[PDB]
Structure formats: C-alpha cells, structure tokens
Design a protein around this ligand. Sequence first.
Ligand SMILES: C[C@@H]1O[C@@H](O[C@H]2[C@H](O[C@H]3[C@H](O)[C@@H](O)[C@H](O)O[C@@H]3CO)O[C@H](CO)[C@H](O)[C@@H]2O)[C@@H](O)[C@H](O)[C@@H]1O
Length: 216
Amino acid sequence: CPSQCSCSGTTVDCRSKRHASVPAGIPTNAQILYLHDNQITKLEPGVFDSLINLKELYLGSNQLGALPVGVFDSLTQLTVLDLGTNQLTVLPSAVFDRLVHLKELFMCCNKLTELPRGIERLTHLTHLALDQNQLKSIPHGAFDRLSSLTHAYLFGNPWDCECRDIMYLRNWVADHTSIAMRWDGKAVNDPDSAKCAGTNTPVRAVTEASTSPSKC
Ligand SMILES: C[C@@H]1O[C@@H](O[C@H]2[C@H](O[C@H]3[C@H](O)[C@@H](O)[C@H](O)O[C@@H]3CO)O[C@H](CO)[C@H](O)[C@@H]2O)[C@@H](O)[C@H](O)[C@@H]1O
C-alpha cells in the first residue's frame, strides 16, 4: 500500500494527505481510487495505464492545471470521474473518448469557458456537473444524446443571455426542469438555478425576442 494511503481490497483511499503528485505503487486491481483533496499539480503521462479495472476515480480539489493526452484511455470500465475544484481551462479533445460507460462526470469549480469536446458522446451520463466555471453558453445539440441525465448542475456560470446561441440552453432547461439542480450542501431541484450573467435572471425564462443574433 502506497505511502500516505490506505487500501482495503480494491479500494485505495488517498484523500486528504497533502499529495503533491499521484503516489507510486497503486495496486493494479483497484476499482475505487480516492485522490481528491490533495495538491496534485500534474498527472504524469501514463499514470493510470495499469489500472484497467478502475470504476471510480476522484481527483477533485487539487491543483490540476492540465490533463495529459490520453490520461484516461486505459479506464474503459470507469463509471465515476470527479475533477471538480481544480484550475482546468482547456481539455484535450478526446480525453473522455474511451469512457463510454461513464455515468457521473463532475467538473465544477474549474476555469472552463467552453463545454469540453466529448461530453456530447457520453450517453450513459446520469450526473453532469458544470457549475461555477465560466461558460457563456452551450453548443447547440450538446445534450441530445445524454438521455440518462437525472442531475444537471449549471449554476454559477456567466451565461450570456444577450446572444441567441443561449437559446439551446434556455430551451433545454425548460424541457428538463426536473433534472436542473442547484447545490444546497446536497442536490436540490431548481430549474431557476441557472441564471443570466449581470441580470441574475433565470436562463429558462429567456425570450426569443429578447435576444439578438448580432450581440454575441
Ligand atoms: C468542494 C465542493 O465543490 C462544490 O460542491 C460540488 C459537489 O462536490 C462534492 C464532490 O464531488 C465530492 O467529491 C466532495 O468530496 O464533496 C463535494 C460536496 O461538497 O458535487 C456536486 C455534484 O455532485 C456539485 O457539483 C457541487 O457544486 C461546491 O459547491 C462546494 O461548496 C464545495 O466547495
């Protein structure tokens, strides 16, 4: 068992141990790896390659500024991926590609400005968390294939209701009011939680006429 970690069968728990990098010696039979709440500043190319039976991976609350290309390619059985509370800005376009069975994707509280490419194809997603980033909008159709969504976290983004290309997210929240969630120390259903930048007005209440294709 790795230094400053605890191991119980297939669970490897290294949360809250001031790790400055992913620790060597992680058992390859591990199905759950808690690495959240450290100050891991980078992931080494290949760091997870050996862990091909991994099902849940938590990397929340670290110092991740970037993800290496293919860092998650080995984890074809992965169902939970938590990346919330890092310093992420841009992701590699195919970083989620192999995660065809992913059900929970947590990415809150980073510095994202566009929806990361790939999210569109993760059809088994039940949870998707994008709250507290810097997204101005959502590309048209990005949620079409995500027909298993029960929780969507969209609050705390500078949504741009001036632009007509908010109308997808507008329409989408109105059509899925029940999966629209805010966070009150837990999950709370709130179709209004997603709000326009500046005005603090609910995104789903945005009117077709109130927008302009020439103000984006
Ligand atoms: C750190 C936390 O981040 C936001 O809370 C989000 C919440 O984070 C979970 C996190 O996934 C979990 O690994 C950690 O151990 O506990 C957090 C709960 O506090 O996850 C939900 C979605 O599941 C939301 O995205 C939350 O926004 C932030 O809102 C909290 O204040 C807190 O800083």
